Point group: C3
Chain length 66, copies 3
C-alpha cells in the first residue's frame, strides 16, 4: 500500500535516530547532534502522521463498506 | 470519527513544528526554541498515541465482528 | 492483541515524558533532562512505529480477506 512506502522512510530515519539515541545513552552527544535528533524526530513524526491519516481513511471507508 | 479530531490537533501542532524544523535547518534556533520544540513533540506524541489506541480498538472490535 | 502490549510501553514512557513536559512548561528543565527527553522520544517513536506497522499489516491482510 501507500502506508508501506511511508513506513520505509520511518525505518531509515529511525536507524539514524537509533544512532543518536546510543550517543545519548553513552553521554557523548554534541549540541549539533542534539539539534539533528530534534529535526529527525520532527521529520519522522510528519511522516507517521500522514501514515496515520491514510490508515484512518482506509478504516472509515471500510466502515462505510459494511 | 474521533480519530479525525485528534488528527486536526496533530496537524496544527505539526505546522509549528515545521517552523522549528526550518530554524534547525537554517542554523538559527535558540535554546528556548529547542525547548519549545521538545515540548511540542511530546504534546503531539501524546495525541498520536491516543489516536493509535482508538484505531486499534476499532480494528479489534471489527475483528470481533467477523 | 500485540499492538496492545506495545501501547502499554508507549503509556509508561509517556508518563515520564509528561513529567519532562511539565518541567519545560515551568522553565526548570536541565540539559541532562533535555537529553533524557530526547532519548525517551526516540524510544517511544520506535515502539509507535512498530505498532503502526502491525496495524497496517492487519488492515492489509483483512483487505485481502474480502
Amino acid at each position: 500500500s501507500g502506508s508501506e512506502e511511508l513506513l520505509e522512510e520511518l525505518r531509515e530515519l529511525l536507524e539514524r535516530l537509533q544512532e543518536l539515541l546510543e550517543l545519548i545513552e553513552q553521554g557523548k552527544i554534541t549540541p549539533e547532534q542534539l539539534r539533528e535528533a530534534i529535526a529527525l524526530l520532527i521529520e519522522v513524526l510528519q511522516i507517521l502522521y500522514e501514515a496515520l491519516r491514510e490508515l484512518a481513511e482506509q478504516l472509515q471507508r471500510l466502515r462505510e463498506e459494511l
